[PDB]
Every structure is written in structure tokens, then in C-alpha cells.
Amino acid sequence: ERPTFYRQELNKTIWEVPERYQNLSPVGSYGSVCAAFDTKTGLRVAVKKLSRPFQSIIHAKRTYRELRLLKHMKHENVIGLLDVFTPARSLEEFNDVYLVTHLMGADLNNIVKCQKLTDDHVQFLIYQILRGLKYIHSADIIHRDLKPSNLAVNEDCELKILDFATRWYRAPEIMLNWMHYNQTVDIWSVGCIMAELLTGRTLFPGTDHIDQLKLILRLVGTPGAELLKKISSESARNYIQSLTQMPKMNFANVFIGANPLAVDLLEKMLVLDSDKRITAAQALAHAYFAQYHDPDDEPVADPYDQSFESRDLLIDEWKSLTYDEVISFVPPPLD
């Protein structure tokens, strides 16, 4: 039996949500999100209505992707799905997708864009990012877009990773347009984020992709022989070979007065060579997180089937696949 939907118009768009969700109140804008009271759980929630979810092949697949990813995430430091619904009674009329998650208090952009943080605070927030990242990465998922505005924190300092300049946090292999980057592109982002929390300033505020690399190389130094031998694009190789050789900065001179353990972790995160960059699992056991690290409570994820990413299908097939996933959704445990 379907719940009772009620209809209302919120600013620019119509919303049709079960009666269970009350006091919809826009929080901003892929789609738009409202804060709501959820009568069944007693919780404040975020309800996102996807805009034009099935309007092109790209939208339809993206819609499918978002639903698949959210349904999979079950970890304290990663956003999870409370609910997913459509007002449609059948596939034929299936046109709208709404997703429901915990309402989070603020993003990390806010916490930093107002005050500097304590070292104890950065410890706990970086710890939590790494713990969520271990989990995400263990599923062979790469976030790819980690930045302060994608990290939600509530008043208790509890942190969750979500997906809602990017270039400022982006690993240099991606800047250089490498096709074969790994999971540690996210570690690079975590490094830029941590640096920003410790100093109150964007570590690498590039105006564009070239400026961005210039700023990066200025701290980390131009690639040595060992890394240059791994660069398969000639114009890329010859770009970095054509710049003036920059030496590696000592990070203790750069992050002066910061906890030396934090400086050390940063040294291990902000490595040009992605093969030598610390992983999330490794970083968790770094001395800097001594007061939080518990090797028996840093879980990995169930295997995640992303074989769909390589499929080329019709809009109606992505739509049908999305509908299946709506239908089979099992709400998480209440306790």
C-alpha cells in the first residue's frame, strides 16, 4: 500500500511527498533540497528532488548512479539513504525521484570560513574523513570531488562525506588530464582540506589549471626522474620538463607551528607521485590520530557492483533500472 502523498509548490518547483514528511523548507540548490520533519522517525531530514532525472541518457545514467551509490553507503562517516520515493504508481508514469537523508548541520566550508580550528578539532575531522574514505575506497569507489562544501558536520563535530573551486582540491594527475588515476586522488584532496583547516587559507587557490599546477609544484617541487619516467603523455611530460625546476619545500617551514605529526601526515598526503601517496587505511594508523584510531571499528564496505558504468543503454532502460532500485529499497533499521 502506497502512502498518502500531498502536493505543494516550493519556490520554483512542485513537490509531491508522502504525508510522513512535514514542514518542507528549501535549503538551496542536479536538483533542489528541502529540510523536513519526518514524523515516522522523529528526525530532521533532507529531501532532494532530482531535476529532470530522465531527460537524456546522461541524466538517466547519473540518476541511476546516484541511487545505486546512496543505497550502498552504510557507514557513520558517509551520507546514507533514509528513503527514496516517487509519487508514480507505475513505471509508465515514473518521472520524479526524491531521495531522503539525515539533515546535516553545516558544511566544512562554514566551520572554516568563520573561524580557525583547534588541532584537536582538525584531528577528529580528518580522522572521520579518512574513516569514511577507507570504507568508500574499499568498495572500489573514488569520490573524485572532495572539498569542504562536500563534507557535512553537525554541532557534535560528527562528519559525513556527501556529493553536494573544485580545482583547488584536485590532485595534479587529474589536472594534467591523466586517464589512469587511482583512489589516492582523494587522499590528495584530504591533504588540501587538512592544510586549509590548520591554516585558515586555501592551500592551492589556482585561477585555472595551469596556475593550479604552478601553485602545487611550488610546494611539492617539480617531479624528479623517477616520476617523469611514469608520464605517458609527451606534452604533459614536456610541460613539466619545460618549467623551471622547483625544489621540494620543507613542510615544517610552510605549516609553521602546526603540530609536527600533522606536518608529517601532510608530507605523506601531498606527494606528487600517486604510487607513493599514503592510503586512507594507512593514514588512519598514522600517529596523528593516536587518540581516535581503533583498528576494530574502521569497517570496510560490501562489494559494490559498478559494471553498469561501462554500459551504454537507452533512456528508458536506465529509467526502468532506476525504478527497480526505488521499488527494492529497504529502509534502514530504526532503534
Ligand X SMILES: O=C(Nc1ccccc1)c1cccnc1
Binding site for ligand IRG (CB under 6 A): 172-173, 176-178, 223, 227, 230-233, 236, 272-275
- Contact status, residue 36 vs residue 82, Cβ threshold 8 Å: no
DSSP 310: G
Selection from ligand X, ligand IRG, none that 231 binds (CB < 5 to 8 A by kind) is ligand IRG
48 binds, among ligand IRG, ligand X, none (CB under 5 to 8 A by kind): ligand X
Query: What gap in Å lies between CA 12 and CA 253, rounded to an integer?
Result: 51
Applying CB under 6 A, the span of 96-104, 132-140, 245-253, 268-276 interacting with ligand X comes to: 96-104
203 contributes a contact to ligand X by CB under 6 A? no
Q: Quick one: 25 or 118, whose CB is closer to ligand X?
A: 25
Chain Cα centroid distance, residue 174: 16
Cross-strand partners of 18: 5
Stretch that binds ligand X, among 97-105, 177-185, 209-217, 299-307 (CB under 6 A): 97-105
Looking at the Cβ atoms of 39 and 154, the one nearer to ligand X is 154
By C-beta, is 46 or 213 nearer to ligand X?
Answer: 46
Residue 55 touches which of ligand X, ligand IRG, none (CB < 5 to 8 A by kind)? none
Distance between CA atoms of residues 141 and 135, nearest Å:
9
Alpha helices in the chain (DSSP H): 57-72, 108-112, 119-138, 172-175, 185-199, 209-220, 225-228, 234-242, 251-254, 260-269, 280-284, 315-327
Residue 9, strand partner residues: 14
Which DSSP category does 56 fall into? Answer: S
Residue from 17, 60, 104, 258 that binds ligand X (CB under 6 A)? 104
Q: Cα separations (Å) of 332 from 70, 102, 284, 297?
A: 12, 12, 27, 20
Q: Does residue 101 touch ligand X according to CB under 6 A?
A: yes
Residue 275 among the catalytic residues: no
- Which cell numbers in the block locate residue 299? 569497517
User: Which residue from 17, 33, 111, 175 is in contact with ligand X, where contact means CB under 6 A?
Assistant: 33
Under the criterion CB under 6 A, does residue 111 sit at the interface with ligand X? no
Catalytic residue, from 140, 163, 316, 324: name it: 163
Looking at the DSSP bridge assignments, the partners of residue 99 are: 48, 84
Beta carbon of residue 209, minimum distance to ligand X (angstroms, whole number): 28
Binding residues among 115-154 for ligand X as defined by CB under 6 A = 152
Q: What percent helix, strand, coil does the chain show, rounded to 5?
A: 40, 15, 45
| 32 appears as a binding residue in the annotation | yes
Which chain residues interact with ligand X by CB under 6 A?
27, 33, 46, 48, 79, 99, 101, 103-104, 152, 162, 164
Catalytic residues: 163
* Binding-site sequence positions: 27-33, 48
